[PDB]
RNA sequence: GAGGACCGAACCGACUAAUGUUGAAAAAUUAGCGGAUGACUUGUGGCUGGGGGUGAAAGGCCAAUCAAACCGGGAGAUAG
RNA sequence: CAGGUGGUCAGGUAGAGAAUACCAAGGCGCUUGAGAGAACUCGGGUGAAGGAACUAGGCAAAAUGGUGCCGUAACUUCGG
RNA sequence: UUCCUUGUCGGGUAAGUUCCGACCUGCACGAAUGGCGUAAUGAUGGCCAGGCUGUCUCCACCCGAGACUCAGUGAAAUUG
RNA sequence: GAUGUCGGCUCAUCACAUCCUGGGGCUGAAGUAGGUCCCAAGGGUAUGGCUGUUCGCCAUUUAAAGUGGUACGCGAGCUGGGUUUAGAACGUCGUGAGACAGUUCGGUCCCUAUCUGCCGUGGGCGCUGGAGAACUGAGGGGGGCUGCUCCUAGUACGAGAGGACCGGAGUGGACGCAUCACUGGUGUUCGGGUUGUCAUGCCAAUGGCACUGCCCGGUAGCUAAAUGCGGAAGAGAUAAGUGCUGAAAGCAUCUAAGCACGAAACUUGCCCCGAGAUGAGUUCUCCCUGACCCUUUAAGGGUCCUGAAGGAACGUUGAAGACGACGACGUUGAUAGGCCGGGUGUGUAAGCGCAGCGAUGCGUUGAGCUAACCGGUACUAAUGAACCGUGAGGCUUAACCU
């Protein structure tokens, strides 16, 4: 099975109307280090909910 | 359908899952904190925490039964000599899953899992 | 007659003293509280709106809370309407118990059947499986032909195909009422009713004989 | 749940004797033939027991007139009038389904001798 | 649970030993016959000097099945083999004069009272 | 201790089915299958050349090529 | 690139065996992963009662399977 | 090898255009382009029986590999 | 510069010239059972033996085993027996190469779906302030089969044999829906037995691998063979048909005026979907009551302040699920895991003691272990926030109030 006519650039754009990425709504701010992080994820320096959970 | 079924397949056969969680449980009690994917971490709870509950009653029967689940005497020794007494008063929930970033190689959701009493005094041994 | 909203507790059996096992479905029917009465003047049709169960105050929204406060009843886990037959009168805030079915012999139970997800034509429409051997190539559980040649040149609407199965409203009619336990809010009907354990059921007297 | 188990415990018999797979029991059931109701005995080996509270059951096997017969009883049914253990057998398993393939001397069961 | 091509033992003394169900009577597309159902049979094996001979086509009533019967209280009564009783092709009366092995009370009907009265044991 | 003897691995083969069929593969894989001391199989080297070779013979094979190979030439053959 | 490629070497336990299973010496995890646990396809496991009713056809599957001893028909070219 | 033809009769089956036995009316057998037999042999053709079974009545569940979602890479036939 | 060609399988759909069931007229219709014609398409409408077969014959059923259309429906769905290539053979024809709807044995069935269609399931925007619910029902779909026995009644009818209409009751087959209490299947996540081998130093005890190594049982879930329910009654308008009154036409006449009956068809009644029903409906509840500037001065633009109801996101998840969606829950917390207790399953662990030369047996012991189950329990993980969504909601007219 294969196309009988070349689909247009218009049809191609309509199909991709749902391919748009959804940016992260908002980052959480740690209460101790004040860093930004994904909610429910530890920070880049190992903080989570105001606690140094990993020492690296 | 999947109604009321439990346990993840993790894209492995049964014998591979059993071997993997046996190794992963041994690594968890040896280092007290490891980093793995979030699905593997959640299933590891149903493996390692029953071992800690088993290690609360020291006996040759429990030790052998724990050895059958881990196949490592160094692991069994630490379970009954360290982790047993350390969790003698805690009623379940010996682990803690902390979500972290995504693995660079495949964008897998990673997570730390650690024993709850891995405090600043663990550096003694 | 109006009906009641209950919860499917599960299935068990009742042994009759003459040695007959009756498979029953236990339906927990707590007090149904009338929250709104509709009439021909204001709404164009006669019906009552009832609620049942309880709900945590932190989970009810202000629009819903104001609706229950208007009636003066505690918030339940949902709202259901029942068309009133000619002669039935109810007041808002009035509570209706399971003993309404004291003399009812047969009921119709409505619920949401258990969801099977995406189901093939064999499971969903009882299609016949093609040959498992004798040369069959990758076509064991496929539906086979779905139409005729060029003359229709299309697939007719309503063709039986694979798709979502279950998880829909289903009514079982004319179920015998085995026992009405008013003091325990229980209603035992003979047979099986749609839905899983813990799902909401709507029990009405049998519209047929 | 608390609701259903409450409905079941008020229907269960309180005097069902204890028996194990391998014991030969004599079950007496109620046979209704119109205006009469007599007790018909059914003696054989217990080859399976299903413990489910009210839904408990057990299946008895006997060789009747050369034909092997198995009957599954609902232990809490009012049809089952009484249950009596004749002799206690000594088996290692919980389901004696292998007895279906044996007969005569091959289907013998050691007495528990307790 | 007897269907076509099923081999049954004979529970009477009419002379047949093995019969094969060739039709489940009493309804279009009817699939199975339980205890108490009439079936059309052919005789696959008979004794040398019985009342019937190999090849005859008769009717029979099923009296024992491995699938078993279900009682109103949920009990089951299973047997070790399937057995039937040969009936006259048009009169529906038993051909033999004796019945071997037990039967069930599903046969308790005026149509098969002759079989119930002759059975060594009714279950 | 005979055998174009028997059963059966290597080895040689290719009977059935499924898979694959823009393949992992321009002929395979998987499970079974035949022969397996012989008219056996295999390595290295050699010989036979195109109306010719070779063929336990299928018009089979002769470099993924065959009712007349391939390459160059006649050649821009001829084409109602 | 699941193909093809001659010769040499030949550990242990079980086994008739270079079959097969599990291992040694030694070498590898096959150059995308992570989840999910729909239909459907592929490769498998189990199956009530029935047992070829399937089908062009028992196709496929299931089944049989070893050693010792007992025993073994028609027919026969006297070997089977 | 027989068109008529599913010839006729017998056997097998509850039922047999196939099969086996016979008949002879050989459309259009026939004696080294061999006739008729024939033990053994056959991945040969047809037919029957036992065993066996998801082949089927009539499908059910389960274990794996895909399908599906996320990240990376990234084709093809076809196309006024 | 290709429209794959028989039959089967799967899946159908329409016609009515109706096979069954329903309603009738006539009968050389006593009854039963038929014959024939009219109306009627709602539903239903065999399994096997033989053959490639369609067909047909045969066996045995059934209320019946309808006739046709649909590319002799259906190969980008399956099959490949037949037909239809290359091999080979027979009969036959031909000197021969070869040939034969004559026969015989053998003989590669490709395609990842762009569009239409169809089955499902979402996103967007709309519906005129926003939001959360509950509905109305325009419209659409599903469903509609039937046997047998008993009573009426051995009555009506009939010489007898035989044997009813109408009406009522029970119980089946096929089909459909739902469910898992029971009976079972499965249950590579539970327990046990056991073969070979390797390992844990060794014994003992375990683990790995051998299809889950092979097996025996089996929880939850899923499920049929399991067990509940369904097809209706009723109503409206009718078909063929039967009529009442009744002229045209002193009579007669079912019809012309008028009136009454009349079928599984039609419209309802039953079940499901359903306000994108743009003709975008209704009801209830909830939320928002700040400034200021510019300009071409309007359904205008801008700044500051403000951010509600609610939503989404994220997390724990679900008998919900391909993904979205849908549901529950997020410390004022039982959402998941763990833990505790129970249940269930398996069947008397290990260790020790005793007996025995030993294999093993006995006692401790219905022991030990026990997945998805039940009841509990904040031990672990579900975070303070942030984000989206605003600030009283056009014009005209009419009835009401000011």
Swiss-Prot record, chain B:
Ribosomal protein recorded as keyword: yes
Protein transport recorded as keyword: no
GO cellular component assignments: cytoplasm; cytosol; cytosolic large ribosomal subunit
Gene Ontology BP term (one): cytoplasmic translation
InterPro entries (UniProt xref): Ribosomal_bL17 (IPR000456), Ribosomal_bL17_CS (IPR047859), Ribosomal_bL17_sf (IPR036373)
Keyword terms: Ribonucleoprotein, Ribosomal protein
Residue ranges of coiled coil: none
Description of how the protein assembles with itself and partners: Part of the 50S ribosomal subunit. Contacts protein L32.
Homology family: Belongs to the bacterial ribosomal protein bL17 family.
Its biological purpose: Requires L15 for assembly into the 50S subunit.
Protein name: Large ribosomal subunit protein bL17
Originating organism: Escherichia coli (strain K12)
Gene from which this protein is expressed: rplQ
From Swiss-Prot, chain C:
Coiled-coil region(s): none
GO cellular component, as recorded: cytoplasm; cytosol; cytosolic large ribosomal subunit
GO terms, biological process: cytoplasmic translation; ribosomal large subunit assembly
Residue numbers bearing the N5-methylglutamine modification: 150
UniProt keyword list: Methylation, Ribonucleoprotein, Ribosomal protein, RNA-binding, rRNA-binding
One Gene Ontology MF term: structural constituent of ribosome
InterPro entries: Ribosomal_uL3, Ribosomal_uL3_bac/org-type, Ribosomal_uL3_CS, Transl_B-barrel_sf
PTM comment: Methylated by PrmB.
Residue numbers carrying N6-succinyllysine: 38
Keyword RNA-binding applies: yes
Subunit (UniProt): Part of the 50S ribosomal subunit. Forms a cluster with proteins L14 and L19. In pull-down experiments interacts with CedA.
Function per UniProt: One of two assembly initiator proteins, it binds directly near the 3'-end of the 23S rRNA, where it nucleates assembly of the 50S subunit.
Similarity comment: Belongs to the universal ribosomal protein uL3 family.
The protein's name: Large ribosomal subunit protein uL3
Protein's gene: rplC
From Swiss-Prot, chain D:
Domain of life the protein comes from: Bacteria
Gene responsible for this protein: rplS
Matches recorded under NCBIfam families: rplS_bact (TIGR01024)
Induction profile: Part of the rpsP-rimM-trmD-rplS operon.
Protein name: Large ribosomal subunit protein bL19
Species the sequence originates in: Escherichia coli (strain K12)
Functional description taken from the UniProt entry: This protein is located at the 30S-50S ribosomal subunit interface and may play a role in the structure and function of the aminoacyl-tRNA binding site. In the 70S ribosome it has been modeled to make two contacts with the 16S rRNA of the 30S subunit forming part of bridges B6 and B8. In the 3.5 A resolved structures L14 and L19 interact and together make contact with the 16S rRNA. The protein conformation is quite different between the 50S and 70S structures, which may be necessary for translocation.
GO MF terms, alphabetically ordered: large ribosomal subunit rRNA binding; structural constituent of ribosome
One GO location term (cellular component): cytosol
InterPro entries reported in the protein's UniProt record: Ribosomal_bL19, Ribosomal_bL19_CS, Ribosomal_bL19_sf, Translation_prot_SH3-like_sf
Family from the record: Belongs to the bacterial ribosomal protein bL19 family.
Record-annotated membrane-spanning stretches: none
UniProt keyword annotations, A-Z: Ribonucleoprotein, Ribosomal protein, RNA-binding, rRNA-binding
Oligomeric form and interacting partners: Part of the 50S ribosomal subunit. Contacts L14. Forms two bridges to the 30S subunit in the 70S ribosome, contacting the 16S rRNA. In pre-50S ribosomal subunits interacts with RsfS, which may inhibit association with the 30S subunit.
Pfam families the record matches: Ribosomal_L19 (PF01245)
Swiss-Prot record, chain E:
Family to which this protein belongs: Belongs to the universal ribosomal protein uL14 family.
Impact reported for residue 97 to A: Reduced RsfS binding
Any GO BP annotation: cytoplasmic translation
Effect of residue 98 to A: Reduced RsfS binding
PROSITE patterns (alphabetical): RIBOSOMAL_L14
Sections of the chain in a coiled coil: none
Record-given protein name: Large ribosomal subunit protein uL14
Keywords attached to this entry: Ribonucleoprotein, Ribosomal protein, RNA-binding, rRNA-binding
GO molecular function: large ribosomal subunit rRNA binding; structural constituent of ribosome
Quaternary context: Part of the 50S ribosomal subunit. Forms a cluster with proteins L3 and L19. Forms two bridges to the 30S subunit in the 70S ribosome, contacting the 16S rRNA. In pre-50S ribosomal subunits interacts with RsfS, which may inhibit association with the 30S subunit.
């Amino acid at each position: 099975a294969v196309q009988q006519n070349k689909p247009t650039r218009s049809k191609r754009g309509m199909r991709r109307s749902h391919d748009a990425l959804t940016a992260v709504t908002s980052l959480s701010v740690d209460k101790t280090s004040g860093e930004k992080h994904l909610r429910h994820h530890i920070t880049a320096d190992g903080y989570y909910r105001g606690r140094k959970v990993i020492a690296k | 359908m999947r109604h009321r079924k439990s346990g993840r397949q993790l894209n492995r056969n049964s014998s591979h899952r059993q071997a993997m969680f046996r190794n992963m449980a041994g690594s968890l009690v040896r280092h007290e904190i490891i980093k793995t994917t979030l699905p593997k971490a959640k299933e590891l709870r149903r493996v390692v925490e029953p071992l800690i509950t088993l290690a609360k009653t020291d006996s040759v029967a429990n030790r052998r039964l724990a050895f059958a689940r881990t196949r490592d005497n160094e692991i069994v020794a630490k379970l009954f000599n360290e982790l047993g007494p350390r969790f003698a008063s805690r009623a379940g929930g010996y682990t803690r899953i902390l979500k972290c970033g995504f693995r660079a190689g495949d964008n897998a959701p990673m997570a730390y899992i650690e024993l709850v009493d891995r405090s600043e005094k663990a550096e003694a041994a | 007659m109006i009906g009641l909203v209950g919860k499917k507790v599960g299935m068990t059996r009742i042994f009759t003293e003459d040695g007959v096992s009756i498979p029953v479905t236990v339906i927990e029917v707590e007090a149904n509280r009338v929250t709104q009465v509709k009439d021909l003047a204001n709404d164009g049709y006669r019906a009552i709106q009832v609620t049942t169960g309880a709900k945590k105050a932190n989970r009810v929204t202000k629009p819903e809370a104001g609706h229950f406060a208007k009636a003066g009843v505690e918030a339940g886990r949902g709202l259901w309407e029942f068309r009133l037959a000619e002669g039935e009168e109810f007041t808002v805030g009035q509570s209706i118990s399971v003993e309404l079915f004291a003399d009812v012999k047969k009921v119709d139970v409505t619920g949401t059947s258990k969801g099977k997800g995406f189901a093939g034509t064999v499971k969903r429409w009882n299609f016949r499986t093609q040959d498992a051997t004798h040369g069959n190539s990758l076509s064991h559980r496929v539906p086979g032909s779905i139409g005729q040649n060029q003359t229709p040149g299309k697939v007719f609407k309503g063709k039986k195909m694979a798709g979502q199965m279950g998880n829909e409203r289903v009514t079982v009619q004319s179920l015998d009422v085995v026992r009405v336990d008013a003091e325990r809010n229980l209603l035992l009907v003979k047979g099986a009713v749609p839905g899983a354990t813990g799902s909401d059921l709507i029990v009405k007297p049998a519209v047929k004989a | 749940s608390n609701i259903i188990k409450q409905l079941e415990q008020e229907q269960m018999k309180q005097d069902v004797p204890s028996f194990r797979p391998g014991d030969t029991v004599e079950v007496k059931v109620w046979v209704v033939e119109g205006s009469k109701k007599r007790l018909q005995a059914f003696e054989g080996v217990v080859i399976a027991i299903r413990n489910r509270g009210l839904h408990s059951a057990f299946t008895v096997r006997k060789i009747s007139n050369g034909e092997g017969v198995e009957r599954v009883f609902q232990t809490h049914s009012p049809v089952v009038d009484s249950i009596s253990v004749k002799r206690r057998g000594a088996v290692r398993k919980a389901k004696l389904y292998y007895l279906r393939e044996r007969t005569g001397k091959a289907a013998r069961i050691k007495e528990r001798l307790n | 649970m007897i269907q076509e091509q099923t081999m049954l033992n004979v529970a009477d003394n009419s002379g047949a030993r093995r019969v094969m169900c060739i039709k489940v009577l009493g309804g279009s597309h009817r699939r199975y016959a339980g205890v108490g159902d009439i079936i059309k049979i052919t005789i696959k094996e008979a004794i040398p000097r019985g009342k019937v001979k190999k090849g005859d086509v008769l009717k029979a009533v099923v009296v024992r099945t491995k699938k078993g019967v279900r009682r109103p209280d949920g009990s089951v009564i299973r047997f070790d083999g399937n057995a039937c009783v040969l009936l006259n092709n048009n009169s529906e009366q038993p051909i033999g004069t004796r019945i071997f092995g037990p039967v069930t009370r599903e046969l308790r009907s005026e149509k098969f009272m002759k079989i119930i009265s002759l059975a060594p044991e009714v279950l």
